[PDB]
Amino acid sequence: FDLNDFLEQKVLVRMEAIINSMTMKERAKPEIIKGSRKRRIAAGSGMQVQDVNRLLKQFDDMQRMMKKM
RNA sequence: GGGGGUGUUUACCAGGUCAGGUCCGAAAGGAAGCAGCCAAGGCACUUCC
């Protein structure tokens, strides 16, 4: 369950804004994402790292559930 | 080494363009700019000098 699938699914607009800023490797293997990338991703989608962490946390909560069925 | 070609590779660290998103502005409109692509670089093969 990659960030892409998570993207399939008015604040939601900002969630996308943030995923459309990652690379295909990022969208595919989220963990590789750390400070540096975050800095690029947020600033790329006019967001703050927190928003990214926010989304990143969201996705996590999401993936987790998936890995339970 | 240089020119040409082919395959491959490359998050950000003063190339270009800029979906999405952001910023400034009452507006009209300005600004920066991620991914992408183009470009460019790296690893080679080929061909010419």
SS3 A29: coil
* Angle of CA points A58, A28, A10, to nearest 5°: 40
Domain residue ranges in chain A? 1-68
Q: What is the resolution of this structure in A?
A: 2.0
Per-residue flag: A16 CB under 7 A of strand B: yes
Method used to obtain the model: X-ray
Per-residue flag: A41 CB under 7 A of strand B: yes
The distance of Cα A40 from the centroid of its chain, to the nearest Å, equals: 12
* Angle of CA points A58, A64, A67, to nearest 5°: 150
Q: Which nucleotide is nearest to A46 (CA to C1')?
A: B22
A1-68 placed in CATH 3.30.70.20: no
Q: With contact defined as beta carbons under 8 Å apart, do A51 and A18 qualify? A: yes
Q: With contact defined as beta carbons under 8 Å apart, do A45 and A18 qualify? A: yes
Tokens 């892409």 -> residue = A4
Q: What is the DSSP letter of A22?
A: S
Number of other residues whose CB lies within 10 A of the CB of residue A64 = 10
Q: With contact defined as beta carbons under 8 Å apart, do A16 and A7 qualify? A: yes
Enclosing H/E stretch for A36: helix A35-44
Q: Which nucleotide is nearest to A13 (CA to C1')?
A: B21
Half-sphere exposure of A64 (CA within 13 A, CB side): 7
